[PDB]
RNA sequence: AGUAGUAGACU
């Protein structure tokens, strides 16, 4: 293992005095501070000046458009729908619709569908409402739930419905008339979802009786609650109809005693990409979600009025969004509840609480892109007007770069404008959705964060957001080429000098860097690295540059990689693992990272861009690169990671909130003392110490060639420079980058060149690829960039110390985002002796004391920003704030304090589950709620989320009396059923937060076993029989539910190899051939290829419609149902009769807040036992740090197992089973200010926080 | 007609 000798980077040993002289000249100049001061008049004026020049940008519209995705009403307290009530209500409703005289085509097709339903035969009405086992296809009813109407039986208007498959219009928001109208409409809706319709572990539950009273017992009565339970029914019917074989037919369902009818039209199925399900409703006008201007019509039928809504078309995303809408609104309102009680100190009153619930529900039902964009902008507008200086001018200017199509948008504009003006005018903090003033700032921003998270990800239009991601890369590449044809290639790759600045031919733009600044920044970082030479030499060795490639985890993953160039002109799209198996089938060795770089470097760095599907209003990047690109980036990030481990001010490679708040605490500690100065004559001038947080924010405009001169000048504590020159040669190869436009866009552009399309097509010069230079490629160089930023800030600190040595200032930072702290110095007294000192310095040559007389922190920021710009870093003038109190870093609101939003974690427990069974999804959903308990959510919220997500799962599978309700079959009570047999979850939060998830199963088994060992009773034998049936087919079994190189090894070969080499169940092979076999065994695993062939995560959650009755459980080599698995379970458990196998498996036994850590190699030891032949032992030795303490530590572990359990691993059956026990042995916890990192002081905090208003001692 | 958009789409 030798590194070849690459060419080093030429250097030019700079002088700090030259750049100090430049900075002195730069400070005696005219520089205006880029952030404006925040005044109420300036904010009102910005709203006026944007509002007046507004309507000339768009065309005025005549009516506000649609925003409700479904309309409906309720006669009273809703009762959910069974199959019998569906049939009777459908007959009632189609009798009522046949009395209509049709006019508008919706009425025509509703009358036709109802007529054909009332022609249905006596024996088809049976097969309409029939389970899909006894079902049998008849004349008009081919699927259960559908019928078959035909287009020869249709009124001429109905075929018009079937066949109906420059500036934008916008409501004038500058007009008080239209603002009053849209506000009146939305207040009518929101006022209508609040009417009191009327109602239809023991410690935690007694307190939860107090939360359930003050929350659920008030919100259980409202109209919004029952309408949410109704939308759930309508969406269950739509999801049923959206399958493949069903969607090609018609349907009619009815709800609420025949008060709401749902007509579903034939449509293309939702299993395929880009399809819709069209439908409409017919309903009695009354209490509901009604928007009367987007109803199709209203008729009068024997006195009562009926609303016919429009024909809606919905995608698969918004359908699941509306299916979970009740749960989302309820979870977000309970979140609001906790924040309010924490803030004010008691429970909210029922009037504001009901209005909050209704607002959340309306947002959950709209689900439009244009409202998501509004809340996206609002979370930036809120800190920009409560800060001292900020860029609110440009933010409010971007708030107006949209049309306001519907009426909910104009209503949102009004309430947002009022909130922003009232925030700038003024602690005191007005809420947005109620009439509540807050105390702390965190409550108000948390409210807007909660409203932003109610919107699903990916609401953007596909072919219009897929073109908007290529645009940024193309236009920054145009900028770079402009600079290259103006300055020449050498100044682009090498940088300018300070003499070029002051001659005046180069200016400090953004895609250009300074030679002196880069090298002197490296020199400051070097002065921090020269100290810890030992640890720095020992980190560069522990990255292992001679461990072979492909034998790391990351190089054999599931992450997507480009492949070889096709025929159409694009790249392939394989997976990391496929290209790992593809290289090894001609490599002939398993080479290491330097020898793969030496192997694959004549190829250029291809890349491709693929949407991240975020919720923010402009969707971002994510690149997919080839293998040679991934090699070079591996080399560079490994080097820079080893170096950046020992630098405290770099926060990428580095449990972030702990270190952040240590930095804040240090900085607040500096401003306790009081600096002062003695003058020439001996005047003693006293000063104060202030702080000024600059929450910075920002990167495609950034030359990647500054890193070469930064890398070559870094001290690393090595005996030579053969690795450094290889890192430089790797960086010299990521300069240029071929960029490929995706197939979707290339097709789309050909399905139609205006003006903005034609220049974009001229960039690619009539191909699919074009070269970019000096590109960052999203996060593929993050450790580099954050170390470079921290270096430049250190350079600034020393330069400020050497311009004003008299003044004992301060400085600190944090480069994830970024948070700079400036410890400036206030003259304290009112007397002019400070101004006289500034005079006495300003005549005596020191002209640069001109920028320090007044304000002064502005000059710290100006010089810091200029040095950062000389290193190509541009601080954003739009989303930066400046205030002497609050701060925001990497999505956490700091105030000195800490506050995580955590609502993302809850709203992810309802949406998106892995789809791997009942047990698997139950565990994932409950693990989300424990994780949200970690981050701020009090025991009762995580309890409510546990209850809700568990109920969602048991209804999504049917194990509740339903299709798979196991208590119909089994002789054990629901308490005693194991989990993976659809049993009761045995669910709590105060146990899952402390123990694990699979403890309760242990309990069930344990109970029977212990009862058995004392009584030999009968149902306990049955519990053991169920557990044995689980083990035949987690610390028990689980029921199983429902690619180029995928069979180079027949399955018997993989089984025989799995027996011959059972050490590899812990350890990745280092040789080639065991690796090729170990990797095909990783393919043929069908959990893995399940995770590859079902990549869009909506499809699997939606195919939980089919996965009910369908043959979806493995049993005896047969896909069967779920009911026959329970049949087989009861059979075996009543025919079972036996202990010590069971014994070896049972014998594993209001203040402000801060952030602590809760805590209750190894795999190489557990491999050392199964080490048998010489190759396997050499693999175990490579896999281990100190490879000769190993045979000691195993013995140390051995008796340790006998220490507290009572087992021997010198029996082979024991050690295969309790390997998870010894994997399992730091979840960060946002806990109050009087908590210590020991787990027994966090567990007391959780118990003390069971009551939100009353005190608890323990 | 719905989703979407100041980039021509889909049912």
Residue numbers in the entry: 225 to 389, 401 to 435, 450 to 675, 700 to 927, 931 to 974, 978 to 1031, 1034 to 1097, 1100 to 1179, ...
The authors write:
Sin Nombre virus (SNV) belongs to the Hantaviridae family of the order Bunyavirales, a large and diverse order of segmented negative-strand RNA viruses (sNSVs) containing several emerging pathogens. The multifunctional ~250 kDa L protein of hantaviruses, amongst other functional domains, harbors the RNA-dependent RNA polymerase (RdRp) and an endonuclease and catalyzes transcription as well as replication of the viral RNA genome, making it a promising therapeutic target. The key player in hantavirus replication is the large multifunctional L protein which, together with the nucleoprotein N and viral RNA, forms viral ribonucleoprotein complexes (RNPs). The endonuclease and cap-binding functions are required for viral transcription initiation via cap-snatching to provide short, capped RNA primers derived from host cell mRNAs.
We established an expression and purification protocol, allowing us to obtain highly stable SNV L protein with the endonuclease active site mutation K124A from insect cells. Applying PEGylation, we succeeded to improve grid preparation in lower-salt conditions of the L protein in complex with the 5′ RNA 1–18. Single-particle reconstruction yielded a map at 3.2 Å resolution, comprising parts of the endonuclease linker, the core lobe and vRNA binding lobe (vRBL), the RdRp core with the fingers, palm and thumb domains as well as the bridge, thumb ring and lid domains. No density was visible for the N- and C-terminal regions containing the endonuclease and, presumably, a CBD, respectively. This suggests that these regions are highly flexible in the 5′ RNA-bound conformation of the L protein, as previously reported for other bunyavirus L proteins. The viral 5′ RNA is bound in a pocket formed by the vRBL, core-lobe and fingers domains. Nucleotides 2–12 of the 18mer RNA are visible in the map and form a hook-like conformation stabilized by three base pair interactions between A2 and U12, G3 and C11, and U4 and A10. Protein-RNA contacts between the 5′ hook and SNV L include the side chains of Q388, Y525, and K559 from the vRBL, N290, L403, R567, K617, M618, K619, and K654 from the core lobe, N737 from the fingers domain as well as M1031 and V1038 from the finger node. The fingers domain spans residues 735–920 and 983–1058 and contains the fingertips (residues 884–894) and finger node (1021–48 with missing density for residues 1032 and 1033) insertions that are conserved among sNSVs and the Bunyavirales, respectively. Both insertions were well defined in the map and the loop connecting the two short α-helices of the finger node appears to stabilize the bound 5′ promoter RNA.
